[model samples]
Each structure stands twice: as structure tokens, then as C-alpha cells.
Target: REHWATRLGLILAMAGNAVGLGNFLRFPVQAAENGGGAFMIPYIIAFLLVGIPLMWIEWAMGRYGGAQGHGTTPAIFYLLWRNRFAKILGVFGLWIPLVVAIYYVYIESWTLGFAIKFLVGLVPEPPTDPDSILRPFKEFLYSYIGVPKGDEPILKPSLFAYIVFLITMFINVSILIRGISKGIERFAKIAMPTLFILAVFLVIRVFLLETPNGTAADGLNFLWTPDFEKLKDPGVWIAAVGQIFFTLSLGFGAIITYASYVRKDQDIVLSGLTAATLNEKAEVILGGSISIPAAVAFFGVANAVAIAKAGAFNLGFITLPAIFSQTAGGTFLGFLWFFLLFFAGLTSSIAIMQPMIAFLEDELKLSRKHAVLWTAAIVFFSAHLVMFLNKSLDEMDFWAGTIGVVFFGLTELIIFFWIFGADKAWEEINRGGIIKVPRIYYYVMRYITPAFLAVLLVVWAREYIPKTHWTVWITRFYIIGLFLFLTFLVFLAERRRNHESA
Candidate 1:
């Protein structure tokens, strides 16, 4: 198999790929608004049930595929299933990451732009009243990133935002063009450690804050106290699983693509666990500790809850800066926060880009440079659509970011556990495992994981189906057409290969 330059580099790269904006920006808000301590129950359950097993599954499958000299899902699936439609189904693995990356790059540029704003001292000063800060900060989001009010025309392309977008996309594609070892692994080596240090520093700063409601306990209590009754709500569990899916970077072919670079004898089981552990530490220990508590400490618990409900971006971009401005060394801390966010977003952005690049490289036999060039060209056009078309972007995000991942995850689970045979999949998992996986998880992987995914899909459809509008339906079908179009290209690639062989 193609191997990472170093074992440590591979692990860090995997960790960097998993630990992204979901860790810092999304998790804190997800935890806060979702009954705080109560959220941890389902979150941990989902982690064990779906997340870890899926991580191992993808790693096993990727390494298995890589040994056969395949990197992307279509090839990997054909190798695994020996069936034609599996290749089409496996399109989710390719399409989800590529489609999510389109809009995700735009969101990423916000962090970079905000970081620049802080560095250049453009961030407005906070008033004595912390709540008063939200209006101006909201305006910054509207004016700069073009996240608009309902039915408002999305802002005509802002030059600064587009410049930041170009810079971000350039950096992303440039690194990708360097291939796995030189580009991603080397960058992850630096960025992951720096990300940790910055997060820790912010965590320490948050711990030291003088609480608004007399004691630091106020913030901690708000976060840690369990609203046990809230566990009855199915939405909380759905949110927990959704967060786990997003946070772990499952169902996106990125994990499989990364794992494809792992050597045959590498300890993928232990390595997968280690990467996941690093992500959980960043998310639960560091990410969960910082933003919400910081907000609760500055404002009261009620206000903090409201901020959490206001969505992740409003919390991360708008409210956090407002809170940061009131802190000692406010401007500097704000810079650190956004810069940390920029790093987090960049790492994951690169991860998402690589799967499609791998698809092009492996399927079409393109050089890494040419593969990256084609991938960049595709993303460049689609991403601008995201920048300008907010509704369509939201539609894409719903399907690709939220719904599509679960669909892909469930597909892989069924194929691996049921069709591929649980025993064989289990053997593959244990192949280079450093730690002995418990015998019980074998059953969990076969039965519970698939069942859990089924329930999620059904429940999500029940809730989400009625809520769709005509425009959303159009966008959804358009994306379906887009996926089929791409899959057809892969079909042609495979056909041409077969023809040449004949």
C-alpha cells in the first residue's frame, strides 16, 4: 500500500482531518442548547455505537482497497462488492465530501476574514453592556459573509470576501497539489499542535474569567447540570448522532482516502481510536469547556442559552467576539480564537478536497497536480454558487452535510457487515490492530449500528420531509442530478479502462 511518510504524521493528519470547526464552533453550541450534560449521554452512546465502529470500518476498507491499488469509493466498492450498483451507491462517499466542501470553503473564508479583521484592528469595541455588542457583530456577518435575513437578497459579491475566498481556496488547492505526505501530513504536523495550544490557552483564559452572576460555578453549573427530563425528546438524540457523524468526518470518503495512504501493516484500529480520542479531547474537554462557559460567565445563563439557540455561527462569530472584547487582552484573544478557527476549518477543508482528488487520480489515472487542478476547477465554480445562492447552499448543506453522510454511513455499514460478511470485516479490523477490540463490538457493528442508522433515517425523513419547500426540492433533485452526472463520468472512466484492457 502507499504509506504515510511517518506513523506519527499519519495519526496527526487523521486527527487534524477529524477535528475541525465541528470541534470548536459547533460542539459547544450543540452541547449547550441540547440540555447540556444530558446531551453527553446520547453523544457518548453514538460515539461508541456508530462513530468508532465506522471509523475502524472505513480505515479497514480503505487499507483493503489501497492494497488493491484503489483509493476512491467507486473503485473501493467495486473491489469489496463485485457488483455494479455498489459503485453507484458508493457515489455518496465521493459526492458528500466534494459537495460539502463547496459551501464549507465559503464558511471557512469567514474565519480567515474575521481573523484578518481582528489582526487589522477592524473589530468594534464592546460597550459596557455585553448584549449591546450583538447588533454591530450581526451587521459584520451580514455585510461581510452574506448570511442574510429571511428572503433578503444575498449580498452582491463582496470584493473582500471573494478575495479571502480566493486566498483560502488557493491555499487549499496548493497544499492538495503537494500530495498526501508533503502537503497534508506536513501541514497537519504543525497545525494540529498549534490548534491544541491555542485551544488550551483559550480554555485557561475562560477558566480565569470573573463570572457575571458572582461565581465561576455559574457557567460550569449551566453546562454540567443535567436536565434529565429532556432525554425524552428524540430530537436531542438525533442532534447527538448528527453531531457525532459530522464531528468524526464519517461517511465522507476523506477518511477512507486517508486510510488508503496507510501501509498494510500499520495499526489502523489503534490509530483510528487514537485519532478519535484526540478529536474527543479537543471537542469534549477543550471545545466544550471554552465558548459556552465563557458566554455564560459574561452574560447570564439565560442569555447564554439564547446565544446557543441563535445558531453556531452567531455563537462562534458574533457572540464570542462580543464576549472576547470585554475580556482582558480582548483584541489579542479574539485574534487567537478566529485564527484557531481558521486553522481548524483549513485542516478539514483540505481533507474534504482530497477525496475527490483521490477519485480523479485513482479512477482517471491523473497525476496529483492534474487531479488537483480539475478538483479546484470544479470547486471554484460550485463554491461561488454557494457564496451567491444562500438558499441553495442551505439545501446542499442539509442533504450533503447532515442527511447525506448518514445515508452513506448506513450504506457502508450494510455492505461491510451484511454483504461483505461480519467475520471478514472483523478480521480486517483486527489485521493490524494494536489493541484487542472487545468481542461484543463485533455484534454491535453488525446489528446495533445498522439499526441505529435505520431509525435515524426514518425519523429524519419523518421530521424533515414535511418541512421541504418547492425551491428546496428543486435544489435537492438538482444535487441528485449532479451526483449522477459525476457518477456517470466515473462509469465512463471504468468503461474506458475495461476497453483498453480488452
Candidate 2:
């Protein structure tokens, strides 16, 4: 709704958006799932080609549009292209992340659930029995997630999970109601530092933790080294590049919305670069150190790789839980671990929510409270569906969170780089810059960036096709239905404004 309280605050909030669960949860998981070293190669390539330029472009568009009284992506698109349907095409801004937070908030609640467990001394000590390392912690993962060991009909749900879910909702809603500087920026300032400190501490602890099968050094080697044969699979490249958008917050709509709050005269080029730099530091340095290394160190290298394929999310909760409980003074470590993730999730969840809230307020003229209320309304119902249904979270994440943003990336490239003209877009990016953006990107944004994104979309097209399952279809239509509704809203909003001026 307003400018960030300070430059540092603004960058932290932006960094928080990019740095969350992805760095810790998704980055390591994806890296392991692809080829460890092979994934690293494409990942570094993607970061330079796609990540930096799109990020700078988003910030420029946000600040450029902000100066003209627009914040939402659809609104910004309408201004950028001056076409009736352009904003509707931009409706993915509202749809993608709103859909992402449905599963996201549910997952965020899990961190709180685990945090509470560690804080209260409810966790079991790590097992030392032969073949015990994997099984004991693995069993708890199923139990804690309410995955059924003893089957009923479909679900064996966690009652505790529901309670934590409610509490999580209240926390997010409370922070959001307080508005930008007070709520979001304040939390970012506190949360980002604590999150980083906790990350550093955990990485050091994993180093100190001597284990049976492999060492922390093994994990680092697995992550940093490349697999040339694995590079042959195009899927490896697709996932690596796609992850850049996910980790950097490019094309997510949240970045554009947040950036709109910055003063036009302020330096976005540096700010965007700095924010992107912070994310890479967290992801490549601290994030790369902790999870997979802990896995390879705790379990054998082969087993850690096996677990990566079975469930990427399991590494953080299952493998790490065992590690935390097994290590001395482990309870405090567990608390720090999950709470750090909770803060990470909280900042990210809050970041995604703002674009939609700003949409409701800016275009429809909803009061901030009302906007928050209704947006949460949209989120709440989806949460119930997602929480209850098997495979729902995966469906939501793949389509809405992952593949959807690629399309968003491509669209922004077309609008900002192509239609807006390279000269105007270039000028906007460096308008108030302390350090000017690289001139080479002037060509990259137009040619290289868009071409890479188009390649990803083409590669993923079949993979993104609707999966066969009951809830999968339901989830797909649910997304499509919500998207249709947003398209209608855009048409209505633009029409109303046009009439008023006429």
C-alpha cells in the first residue's frame, strides 16, 4: 500500500521472498533429484541467464508502474501494452501465488508443528540400531504427516496438525492486518537476520556432527561435483532453470507488487541485484551446506540419494529430525531448525499474499482489512481441499507454483523487453541506480532470456499435462476456475475505469 520503511528493509523483504523454503527445502531436493553435480552446472547457468535479468526487469516494471498508481500485475500489463486483453493475460500474477499459498500455508504449519514438538521435549532420541538410522526417523515422518501406517479408509489425519494450522492462519492474518511498514517490513527486519543466523548455526552444527556412514564433506562433494552423463537428460536442465525462477521470485507477481512500493527515484538496479545476491548466498552457501550434506553424513550416500527420489520434502523433516534428535543439545537445535523454517515460510507466505491484497484494494477499492479478509477466504477453502486430499499439494505445487511461473516469466519478457522497447525498459531499470545494470542484458533480456524461457515451457508442456488421479483433476479445474474468475475481474476493472474517464 505504501513505500518500504527503508532501503535495507525493502531489500530484506525482497530477499526474504526469494530465500524461503526453496533454499532449504526445494533447492537441495531438486539438486539431489536431478544429478548432484550436473544439477549444479545447469543451476549456475540458469541463474546468470534468466534470474538476474528478469529480476531487474520486474523491479523496473514495479517502480515504473508504481509511479503511475498501479501495483498489481494485470493493472501494470494493461498500462504497458494498452490492450484490452493484456491484463487478463497477466491474471496469472493473481492466480499463481494465491494458488501456491494454499499448499504453502499448510506446509508452513508443519514447521510450527515440528517447532512446538522440539520446544516441549516431545521428540524421540535418534536410533543407533543396525538399519535403525533410516527406519525410525522415517516412521515418524509418516506419523507426523498423518500418513497412515495402519490404514483406515483413506486418511489417518493429525489432530495436532489441524490445531497448528489454525494458529498459523491467525499469525499470518494478524501480521497482514497491521499493513506494510509495521507488519511486513518489521517481520522481515527481525525474521531475515534470525533466519540467516539460524542457517549459519545449523550448517556449523552439521559440520561438528560426526556420523557413521559418510561425513559432511561427502555431502558437499556430492552437491558441488557434476555428473556429465546426467546432463544428457533434458529434464535435468528443465528443473534446474525452472528452479531459478522459483528461488529468485521472478515472474511470481510478488516481486513486481513489492517493488511497486519503492520510490521511483530510489536505486532498483542495485536493490534488485543486492536482493538477488542475498538469495544466491543463502541458497548456494548456507542452504547447499546443510540438508543434503546432513543426509549423506547421517545415512550412507546411496541411501540419501534414494530418499531424494522417494520424497524430496522428506529430507528436511525426516533425515534432519533424526540428526537433530541424535546430536547432543538436540532439542534446542530442533527448535531453531523448524522455527527458522517457520519464519522463512511466514515471510514468503506474506510476500505472495500482498499482490492479491493490493489487487483487491487498488482495483476494486476494497479496504485493506476487507481485502485481507476476502483473500484469506479464497485461501481458506482451498486449504481445506488441499489438506484433506492425497496428492493435492504436489498438484498445486507443480502446476501453480512451478510451471505457471515459467509462463509468467515468458510473458513479462515479451511485454517488458519486446513491446516496451529495449531502450525504455533499459532506462527504467537504471533510472535511479547507484550502479547501472549491465548493457549486455539489454540484448539478453530481448533474445537470450526469452529464448531460454520458451525452451523450458516447450520442454515441460507434456510433463505439465494433467496427471491421472481423482484429486489431480479436481485441483486442475479448481485452478482453472479461479483463473477464469480473475480474468473476469480484470475485464470488469478495466471497463469500469474506461467508463469513468469517458
Candidate 3:
């Protein structure tokens, strides 16, 4: 019943999902922090290794699994392991997005809130003190919303945010469930192009703005050129791997889930690579082109430096609103930027929610509608706990956002190429498709991807592990727990399938 009637819809949906927060928001932040143009060098390399192959793996695996009348991993693992570990893995698969949806939607709410405020032409108030700039923003948020404290927030989740998020979530879900062509295919075709257009407009706006001390020129030079020395650094590779994973929405079952709805002979290998490559290109070119330069043009060197010194979690949610308020055309551009971002998040959120819903219906025997509603209910409520609870959940978001995604990407390669056999998959990818792949993909899929991902993991572990405090245990639990859950759900579904067969 989940059909992609058109290739465009499926491709766009996959791309739209791939190019979410990581592209628009986080990419610029990472690039700015690491080394302006220096970041792009390793990022491009990782795109070849970490991003594209994993996408091929996800698409091929998902399509094959769906062809078996399964949702994503249930098919992949059930066809192989058929044990508790497999089912647990599938459940972990479900939990991954479920948790992501919870927090991600919360961030989306921030966009929505800002968009409304932006349109009203009322600039967000500046910070009372430099140290407390975000304080006003947090006050605005917390007065209406509460920080999740002691397992929940001081303020209950706002009914307004809840209702809005629910409507947005369902609209996305409904489109996806309606089938691929109408849902993902069409949505992506239109949304991705629009995003590009908007980006170009913003980039132009940044140029039009006058900078006092050649900051715009400096920013432009920094954003577009690559620092080869940075590329040679191990930390650059680590950052690149992380960006590839997050930017591509790996380890969340989204790609595999989307691909599950694809056909066996669709030439997915090419499609997957095209989708991943194009998406990464957009994130890098557009993301860096717009944000850093725009900030420089608007803020000049001093405020921009203050922001860099202060960090973006403060600047993004705090300093930015004030900067936007003071500039000419800032209000209009602000609204447009956040509005487009909302759509970006909206499209991606639906894709993320779909796989979990599908798993529930396919594996648990819940009706599709029932499963969707139930999934939303749990996801919405649990995520609200984050808004109210301050302690572990905040840390959970960090862990999942970083380490969790890396582990997810590595494991996916292991399963598809190492366990599921990429040789068979590459064969399926080459059949009956419009695009032909290079023979190099076979080795990349089987061995190169695994080896590169292994290097990435070792690098990430080296970078992140030594900094470990109690949070490392939490990071391990967050990732390992999801891994166990996905394997468990797949096993349970297989057992049910066996009982029915018996």
C-alpha cells in the first residue's frame, strides 16, 4: 500500500529527509567553528565514502525489504537472523526516530515561534546582559514553555506548541502514507528547488548589505576556498564523518525506510548516490554561502566575533534575533529564512516518523491509522519530557545527535555489506535502472565503506572518548539501547511470522 508512484517523489523525499537540520543549521555552525573553508575539503571526501555508499545500502536494503512486505529492518533482519537480537535491532530502529522526532519537533517549534514573531515585525528583545542574552529568549520560551526539570520541565508543555506540532506531524505522516509519488516525490521536487531559490535570494541579500571593514569579502573568501592542511588533519576527517552521518540522516532508518518502498530494478545505486551527493553539495554550498557571509555582512566583525566567542546555542536562539531586528530587510529575510527552515524540518520530520509507524503496523499487527496515532502519542508525550526535564534528556539529545548517528551509520554498513551481502545488492542496483554504476561501487559497498567507517569510528572515539565524563556512559547507553531495541523488534516480528506459518 505504501507506493512511490513516481521516481521524483521518492528521490526528493529521500533528499529532503537527508538535507534537514544538518544542512541548514548545523553545517554552517560546524564549518565556522572548525575552519571556515577548511571544513569543506574533508566534508567532500566523506561524501564520497561515508555519505553515498550508506545511502545505497539503505535504499537497496529498504526496497528489498519492502518487496518482502516488511518495513525496513524487519525484512532485512527477519530474512537473516530471525531471533530476539534481530527483533531488538528493529525496535531500536523504531526508537531511534521516535526519539529524534520528539526533540527535532521541539526545535521546529522554535522556528515556528520565530516565524510568527518575525512576520509581526516586532523584533525579539535583546539580552539584558551579555551573559544573559539567551535569557530573554529562554524567558520568552519558558514563560510560554517550561524547561524539562527533574524528569520534566518546570512549565508544562504548551498546548499551543503541542497542537501545532501535532497538526504538522500528521500532515507530514498523511502525505507519506498516501504513497511515495504524491507524498515524498512531489514534495521533494518542489521543496528542494524552493530551498535552493531561497538560499540564492538570501545570499544575494548578504552581498547587497554594506559591511564597514571588508568583513563580507573576508567571509566570502573563507566560505568558498578550501584549506588543504585542515583536510589532512585527523580531526577534520572525524568532523567530516559526523557531518556526513547527520546531514544524510543516517542511523535513523529513514533512508532504508524510504528505499524499502523502492523497486528492486530501479537502479537505486545511482539514485542513492545522486541523492546523497547532490544533497551534500547543496548543504555545503548553500549553507556556508548564506549563513556565515550574511552574519558578517549584517553584524560586522565585532558582533560576529562576540557571537563566535559566545557560541551559537546562545547566538542562534538569542543574539541572532537582536541582530536581525536592527538591520534593513532583516525582518523579511528572517521570516523567510525561518519559514523555509520550518518546511525543511516539516518534510524531514514526516519522513522520520513514517518508518516507525510502518514498523508498528507491519510488525505489531496494528492498523496503519492506529499505529500512526499511537506512535504520535508516545513520541509527542515523551518528547515533551525533554522540554520539561533538564538533566539527562538534554544530554541524551547531544549523545544521540553526535555519537549515536555515527554508530548507526557504521552498523548499517556492517549489516548491509558485511552481513546482508552487498554483492547481491549491487546486482539488484544494476538491474533495470536508467543509470549505470561504476564497478568501483562493489568494493566501496563491501569493504571500503566498512573500513572507512571503521576509521571514522576510531577517530571519533579518539576525539570524543578522552573527553568522557559520566556522559560517556549515557552516550553508550543511548546508542547501544537503540541498537538492542531494533534487533529485538525484528526478532519479535520473526517469531510472530513463524507462529503464523506454524
Would you list the C-alpha lDDT of every candidate in the order shown?
A: 0.85, 0.84, 0.68
True-structure Cα RMSD, model 2? 1.9
* lDDT tens per residue, model 1, 188-260: 9999999999999988888887754533457677767777888888888988988998999998888999999
Residue-wise lDDT of candidate 2 within 326-410, one digit each (tens)? Answer: 7778778978889988999999998888889888888887788998988888887778767766777888898878888888989
Worst 10 residues of 3 by lDDT: 146-155
* Candidate number that wins on lDDT, 2 or 3: 2
Candidate 2 TM-score, true structure as reference = 0.96
What ranges in model 3 sit over 4 Å off? 80-84, 125-163, 173-183, 213-215, 299-312, 391-394, 466-492
Question: What is candidate 3's local distance difference test score?
Answer: 0.68
* lDDT (Cα) of model 1: 0.85
Query: For candidate 3, lDDT tens digit of each residue in 351-436?
Result: 78888878877777778668777767766766655565444454655566666677777776676666666666676556666776
Ten-residue stretch with the least lDDT total in model 1: 210-219
- TM-score (all chains, Cα) for each model: 0.96, 0.96, 0.87
Clashes of 3: 39
Report the error of model 1 at residue 167, Å: 0.3
Q: Arrange candidates, best lDDT first.
A: 1, 2, 3
Runs in model 2 with CA error above 4 Å?
126-131, 148-156, 462-467
Output the number of the TM-score-best candidate. Answer: 1
